[PDB]
Design a protein around this ligand. Structure first.
Ligand SMILES: COc1cccc(S(=O)(=O)N(CC(=O)O)c2cccc(-n3ncc(C(=O)O)c3[C@H]3C[C@@H]3c3ccccc3)c2)c1
Length: 290
């Protein structure tokens, strides 16, 4: 369990970014690691087998906006990125989750197209295949996995921001609606802690949010917990040693460098570190130090 870092990849400030940086909660240090081969914002990060994956996004640059179908793999042992097989379609503002060593890519946008499609990556075979699509088109969708079920939360369907959510049951290759959130959220951070799916922040169509609510998969209720100190949309999120960490985002005025940490035992947030520069739309995941 020792030696794990919080990795943040890509993001946005003025343009899409190629940064890969890793925070050590044990000593407060940040490390700058190998840049992404292509700058990307609106991507998602995940880890399988100790390897860090960067999935989808968009390269917003002065000379273009290119939505990404890319899957790239970072090995901390080598400090090198390697391309993997690309997805069927570009997916900006994507959500991803891992079930039993397989990466699920959910939703996202391609130009004005809002995807309901979903595809699954097999790392050993380096292949993507489409699975059943969601019941709703969703970009800026939050995704997390609990008890080998995959949850897609909120987002934007092309017309409305959403409080709805749904769950994918792999053995039936089927999606079902779950209880909707209390709050409309696009671009929230979604993660799993204990027996709940948490949705932190986002944009409700009017303001960036500091509220946080959690879905109890047993009781099927959404309950608010303590709000974050900072309102933020397009934040990064992960869980580490029983606590939630939120990284960066946009508060309506500033691209935040703030990293906050939620303690579920006390139901409190605290500010634990700052990123090296403010940014939004990062991918985040946890694995061993390089
Ligand atoms: C002012 O500049 C910025 C401020 C913050 C972030 C960024 S971003 O570069 O990181 N980026 C932006 C990109 O992909 O082009 C991005 C990435 C992931 C999630 C979201 N996100 N969060 C809420 C909503 C919403 O409006 O419902 C959306 C975004 C998708 C939805 C949207 C966009 C346009 C019109 C309607 C709806 C955005 C830029």
């Amino acid at each position: 369990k020792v030696g794990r870092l919080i990795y943040t990849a890509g993001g946005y400030f003025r343009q899409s970014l190629s940064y890969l940086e890793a925070y050590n909660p044990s000593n407060g240090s940040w490390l700058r690691l190998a840049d992404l081969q292509v700058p990307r914002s609106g991507l998602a990060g995940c880890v399988v087998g100790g390897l860090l994956y960067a999935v989808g996004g968009r390269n917003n640059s002065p000379d273009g906006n290119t939505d990404s179908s890319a899957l790239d793999c970072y090995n901390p042992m080598t400090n090198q990125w390697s391309p993997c097989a690309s997805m069927s379609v570009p997916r900006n503002r994507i959500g991803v989750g891992v079930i039993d060593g397989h990466i699920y890519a959910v939703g996202g946008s391609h130009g004005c197209i809002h995807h309901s499609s979903v595809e699954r990556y097999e790392p050993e075979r380096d292949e993507w295949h489409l699975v059943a699509p969601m019941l709703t088109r969703r970009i800026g969708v939050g995704v997390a996995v609990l008890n080998r079920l995959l949850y897609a939360v909120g987002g934007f369907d092309g017309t409305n921001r959403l409080n709805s959510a749904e769950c994918y049951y792999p053995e039936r290759n089927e999606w079902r609606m779950i209880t909707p959130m209390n709050t409309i959220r696009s671009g929230a951070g979604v993660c799993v802690l204990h027996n709940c799916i948490y949705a932190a922040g986002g944009y409700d169509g009017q303001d960036q949010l500091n509220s946080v609510e959690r879905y109890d998969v047993e009781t099927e209720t959404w309950t608010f917990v303590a709000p974050m100190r900072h309102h933020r949309s397009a934040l990064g999120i992960t869980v580490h040693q029983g606590k939630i960490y939120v990284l960066g985002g946009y508060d309506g005025h500033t691209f935040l460098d703030s990293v906050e940490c939620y303690d579920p035992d006390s139901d409190t947030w605290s500010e634990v570190t700052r990123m090296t520069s403010g940014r939004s739309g990062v991918g985040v995941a946890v694995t061993m130090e390089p």
